[PDB]
């Protein structure tokens, strides 16, 4: 197994954490505040209270002795800045960082930080594409023009085939899967059914499912 | 003429907004602070400093115009639920709302928000499944037991068939593409060939999947 | 004897929990402020500090074993909400709550308060009848249309008999009780006397009331 | 031409101003928040702006003209008490105040208050009366042994007559009212008939009424 | 001896203390503040850290036993208020009070203070007596006519005898004093000569004081 | 054409300017705060907003012209001190100041303050000495060994002689003055007579007026 | 025509600007506090309150026309960070920055910084070598071995000879210039004479010259 | 030995102490702040937490004992001036204190400060001279006209000769001495070479080094 330290328990870091340590992995806790440490003890292998920008603090926690390092502290730019810069001078091999703003990632990449993330601003564009089309429940982008998508089944596709739907040929696109009910349809037919409000999965060109979407449903 | 509005230029509803004026949607951009406002003035159609707690200033927003508002308040709780309240009762069809932990939840179900969204926990847990398999680059859940994974090919999958690489029969799982340079191959014939650090794209079971990483890749 | 648990000792719940204590029921006073807990230790059974809202120092005060908690904390909406929450989730039979203002109301009769109390502006109300007519000391509603007043008696009412004012034909009104120096008299023969000074209980309908007062007194 | 000021627009104050407006009387709303004014504005003949604590703001008011002044400043001791201070050297006839304490009320009591009140105490009081027993939904005491009580009639007495239940001389108690369905019947025959679910108003001493709760309903 | 008892150990309080404490008093120390008390440690009887708006820790201190309790609190109008009304309540003999301003000291009138004073103001005029007059060293007004002034002489009377300056029936006045070179000089024959820079004691009218000063020096 | 600048409107800073303006000198009020200004604009020649830590904002109030300028700041000990420093170098004949502690003296003095004040001090001793001897009004020290005192007389001295209380023999003192009822005497003969409640003037030695207390009256 | 801007007028950026200025230099002086920027108005050629943290503030101030930008902001390490970033990406040819700290220097080196003051951290390196060598005024080090020292002359030199002090043989260092009362003496001929109290510049090795200060003077 | 205490461990003290104690002397690092103390306990003989503005906690010190004593504190004014005041009081030989502003070192200068400093000030100046002119690397004035410069050398000096350079005729300057590569060469011959980016020493008239820089280089 591989031993993970996440240093800032909030919602994000929290999250990682909590994920982390139900897939059985060696994960150390790291807070500042002493409830977030207490809230957090539960799940996770050592939780401790700690103020990560003292290297003398961070040579305690033996930090040195971790392949992964995930930096979640997010309101305190400088105390994550710092963070990531003493956890570079002490040679650990992977270091991942949640951002704040523009500026904040440039400096991150400066003084040495491995991955960068944004996770509101990502989620944020997720669900603006939700928004603007009720039709897509989620998706994943294979490139800027090519997309799987995930899609629930209105009236007028009620009781359709697959066939009946001709995708590959009047679309380019192709049908992937059927949820019904949560029973679920992997690779179905050309003779395979859909029925209203199934969670159907459709792949092909972005434009093209869009045309799907304002022709077929 | 579909109207969105985005209470609370955070990380999340700034990026939200920006998002949805891209795709040329008619976006109001409102936040209680003033500086808040002159950034996303240049990412929405229009942009207003408001105070979206006071009934009357939302009155005056002209919100009764809007389908969809988007409340992306964070770390004040009261001002998402007070807001979320008032929108209610001002019978706005959609109500999407970010929240802040279990129980923020728990009152913005019972007083009538129509969506709730933990973009933060979300990707944590998205980013603890990178974190355990550094091969997962992106994925999508069809249901608790079955996923869309986009894998990182290895070396040990350099310039090796699909059909070499039978996964249909040996891991009950089916190859859905493949990129390469850049360039996309979909529903790929069996004499197709992965190159290393190529994109390839699989669908299956969670554990088929995990299976075929450690005895494929 | 039932068991009572109030929670906020303000001026109002203060008041509830000395009040029952002095019924002889058993009443555990709960504060986060040490100050008041000490205050009020010797009007209750058990007083103990502790923060509402925190769901395991709730359930280290055994809180699921009381058939009344009463919320009266009243500032802070954040912490009597989510206090109410709790309360709620841990299936308490009678929850009854201080409110601040119309919203508060609101999203406490939404996450299900079974009583709701506006102690200041029910008084507001009260003492303004009695700003408005300097007669009145004391009254209670039937409806909105009739009433039991305790008046002051003028020098206009002094030595008047019962049946010297006939209030039964001329005004529809009817006289419950006499006040004199402290001595009590309950439904007065028609020849009983009053004097000024003296409480005099009337019922009847409002603006019949009023009459008798305006004319009568 | 009588003239109400009322300077402090909390939940009291506000409740005093809002209901002598509604009775169609001369009131003048003050306030040192500006937010609070524009508030009341709507429900007061004049709203004003002002630190009471300042002399001159205070003769600007032309508070000279008012007869009746209502001190509700709550959290601020120092205010109320300067306030009232102020008023009973510019000779104002009758000037009541909200205290906080005992020894606030003290401190009125020697400045010249003409009258005390204490909102929250007192409904304290009358909502623990309504806790310990179910039933009484209003009360009002006429003296330290005597009340009138409105209660919730129970299926013990539905169908019950007025002479079948006899309280005059089973309980030396008398019923004045009987509310069915919203219809009201004032000083009801021996015929009368009590069906459950109605309110029932009954005089007497303390005692005896809470005998024919336990034996009676 | 006399027992006092000093609450707030300001400048005036300090002083107050320390200097009875010189004449050999029982004086006890009394300051919320825990370095005042260890600064007049070496300067009181006993020096008590104590709140003393805190009716308990009164009681503690037992203030019942003396006859002066001396409420030096300046800064905190409601400590001094509040702290004088429970010694009030506590029948203390002598009661002197340290006011703020106009208003503080009518309360302290009205809630039974016994001595009111003004440290600051008092001096205030008597220096700016000497500003306007830089003869006057220091003075004692026996009315508002009359007065008893402590004069530096100047080289207008350097070497004049006291009959050479006749001020019993030139000005109506009289030399108490002549202090040279630190000797002092009572009651001086009509033959005493001053020399310049003496202290010189007159006393008499005010303005014919101030006569003998524009003519006579 | 002598003028007085007052900096700093505290208790003792507002008495001296409201005392010099009462004499009818020329005087100016300065002080950061507004409200202060506003207060003795009545008080004063001229009252001036103003920062006197700024030098530009000192020139600016022309006060090259004052010949007296006194500094009455007191919380701020910074304040006062750079005041004073500016001032010295502005070349002020006379500066005033009022100190805070021995410390804030001992600066003042290097500084080159001309004169250094403690009111509060210095009246703490003078009321130390009534409270230890109630029978004295007020004092005036000639000397460490000798003063000037007004007692107020008791029933021990009513109707008593001027001889008959010989005090130039018996205790070596002098009595220099009786007021009676407010008639004032100067310089009594051998036959007048002193009533209760009188004041008496007396003059010696410290040690041989408070016998004359003990013994005397 | 070169131009020069200092952004943070602290104590170590105003005297750069104002010794800028005093060259007859083109100066920009920028700070956020308005105060600042209205007292180096004076000695700059232009002064402008701005946020250096903006960049339409910076773009506004026209500093693309800079050669060189001094970021003298110290107490608040993240304006100074994201200042020197912007004006990194704003391709400013040199940017040199005060550092706070070591990890300051860092991150500030990383970002592109061309050249970091410690201006407090080196004077305290050249006061210490006061400090123990009281004979030392001021140095300058060649190297970490050689060095060049202005010594103030004892007595144990007064009136001595350059070639009575041999010191090219003896310590193998040259003196370099003596200054007497004033008068500058450069590469003095070996007749030249030393006073006490005169300026004596010597260069040598480090040892060599302290060994001098033992046995020469 | 010599023994140093120095107060406030700032930048400067913190660089004071630091160097002091690397040359072997015995220094007594203060400070009011725990975290400072600990960073510095490393480097100083006794580190000790304390408020030096307290008189006794001074004592406790035993900083009599010191014949220097540094005050490095700067925010402070008011702990600076009082620090150095008590210091002086204490009779200690040397005390050498930091200045933040004009008038602070007036009022240090006038309660008996021995040498005053401006580190920051000083390093402005220095700094300004190299912004100004590249060339410059470090010098030192021997007088307002008079200098020694550290040059860094040019292309337009590659390859030149001391004697080439005719500085002594030309320019009236002198060469001291040239480090190439690290190797330093003191006093060199007529006959040695300069190569660029070498360190030249020159030494002379200010006007004439700028006259050699402008022709020369
Ligand atoms: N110096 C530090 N050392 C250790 N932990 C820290 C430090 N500074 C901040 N933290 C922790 O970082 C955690 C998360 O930071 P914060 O909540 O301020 O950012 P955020 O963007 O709101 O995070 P999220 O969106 O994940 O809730 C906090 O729980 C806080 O205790
Ligand atoms: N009452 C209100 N009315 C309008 N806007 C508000 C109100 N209260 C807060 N906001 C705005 O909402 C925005 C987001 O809130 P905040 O930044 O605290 O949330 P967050 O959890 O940090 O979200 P994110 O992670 O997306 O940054 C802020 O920019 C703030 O100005
Ligand atoms: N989270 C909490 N848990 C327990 N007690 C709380 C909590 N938050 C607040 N309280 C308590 O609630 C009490 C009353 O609240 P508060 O006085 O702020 O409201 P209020 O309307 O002014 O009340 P009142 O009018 O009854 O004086 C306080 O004594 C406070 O200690
Ligand atoms: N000096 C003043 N002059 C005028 N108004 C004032 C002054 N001080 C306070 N107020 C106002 O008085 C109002 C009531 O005070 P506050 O809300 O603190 O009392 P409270 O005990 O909470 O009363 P309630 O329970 O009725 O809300 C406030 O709206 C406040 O703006
Ligand atoms: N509730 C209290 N109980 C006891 N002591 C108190 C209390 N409140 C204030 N004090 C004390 O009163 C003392 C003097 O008050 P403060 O200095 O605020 O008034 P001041 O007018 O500035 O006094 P002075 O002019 O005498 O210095 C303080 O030393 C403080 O500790
Ligand atoms: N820099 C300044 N310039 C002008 N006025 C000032 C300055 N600093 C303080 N003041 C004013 O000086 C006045 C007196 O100061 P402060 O009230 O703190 O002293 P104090 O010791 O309480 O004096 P007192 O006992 O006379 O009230 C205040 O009214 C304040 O507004
Ligand atoms: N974001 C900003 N934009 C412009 N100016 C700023 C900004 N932040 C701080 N400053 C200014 O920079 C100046 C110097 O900062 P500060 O005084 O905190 O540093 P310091 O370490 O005390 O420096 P010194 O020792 O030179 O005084 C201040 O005058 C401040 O007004
Ligand atoms: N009363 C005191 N007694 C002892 N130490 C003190 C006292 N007051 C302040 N100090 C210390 O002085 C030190 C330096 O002061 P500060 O950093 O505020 O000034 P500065 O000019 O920013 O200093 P520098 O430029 O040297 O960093 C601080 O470490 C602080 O703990
Ligand atoms: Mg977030
Ligand atoms: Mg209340
Ligand atoms: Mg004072
Ligand atoms: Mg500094």
Same mark, same amino acid.
């Given at each position: 197994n591989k031993? *993970?330290?996440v240093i800032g328990l909030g919602? *994000?870091?929290?999250?990682?954490? %909590?994920? =982390?340590?139900? @897939?059985?992995?060696?994960?150390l806790a790291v807070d500042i505040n002493e409830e %977030?440490?207490?809230?957090?003890?539960?799940?996770?292998?050592?939780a401790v /209270?700690?103020?990560?920008?003292?290297?003398?603090? =961070? !040579?305690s926690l033996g930090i040195r002795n971790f392949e992964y390092v995930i930096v979640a502290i997010g309101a305190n730019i400088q105390a994550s800045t710092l963070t990531t810069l003493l956890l %570079?001078? !002490? &040679?650990?091999?992977? /270091?991942?960082?949640?951002?704040? #703003?523009?500026?904040?990632?440039?400096? =991150?990449?400066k003084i040495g930080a491995d991955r960068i993330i944004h996770?509101?601003?990502? @989620?944020?564009?997720?669900?603006?594409?939700?928004?603007? &089309?009720? #039709?897509? !429940?989620?998706?994943?982008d !294979?490139?800027?023009?090519?997309?799987?998508?995930?899609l629930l089944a209105t009236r007028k596709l009620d009781s359709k085939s697959?066939? &009946?739907?001709?995708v590959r040929a009047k679309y380019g696109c192709t049908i992937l899967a059927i949820k019904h009910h949560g029973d679920i349809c992997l690779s179905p037919a050309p003779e395979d059914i859909i029925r209203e409000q199934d969670c159907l999965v459709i792949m092909g060109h972005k434009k093209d499912i869009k045309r799907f979407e304002n022709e077929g449903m």
């Amino acid at each position: 197994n591989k031993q *993970f330290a996440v240093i800032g328990l909030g919602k *994000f870091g929290g999250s990682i954490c %909590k994920e =982390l340590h139900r @897939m059985g992995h060696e994960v150390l806790a790291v807070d500042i505040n002493e409830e %977030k440490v207490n809230a957090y003890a539960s799940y996770a292998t050592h939780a401790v /209270i700690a103020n990560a920008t003292e290297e003398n603090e =961070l !040579l305690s926690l033996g930090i040195r002795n971790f392949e992964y390092v995930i930096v979640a502290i997010g309101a305190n730019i400088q105390a994550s800045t710092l963070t990531t810069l003493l956890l %570079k001078e !002490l &040679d650990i091999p992977n /270091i991942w960082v949640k951002a704040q #703003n523009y500026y904040h990632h440039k400096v =991150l990449e400066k003084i040495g930080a491995d991955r960068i993330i944004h996770p509101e601003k990502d @989620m944020g564009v997720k669900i603006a594409q939700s928004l603007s &089309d009720e #039709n897509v !429940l989620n998706y994943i982008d !294979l490139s800027d023009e090519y997309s799987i998508v995930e899609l629930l089944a209105t009236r007028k596709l009620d009781s359709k085939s697959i066939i &009946d739907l001709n995708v590959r040929a009047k679309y380019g696109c192709t049908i992937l899967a059927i949820k019904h009910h949560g029973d679920i349809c992997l690779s179905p037919a050309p003779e395979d059914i859909i029925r209203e409000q199934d969670c159907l999965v459709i792949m092909g060109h972005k434009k093209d499912i869009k045309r799907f979407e304002n022709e077929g449903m």
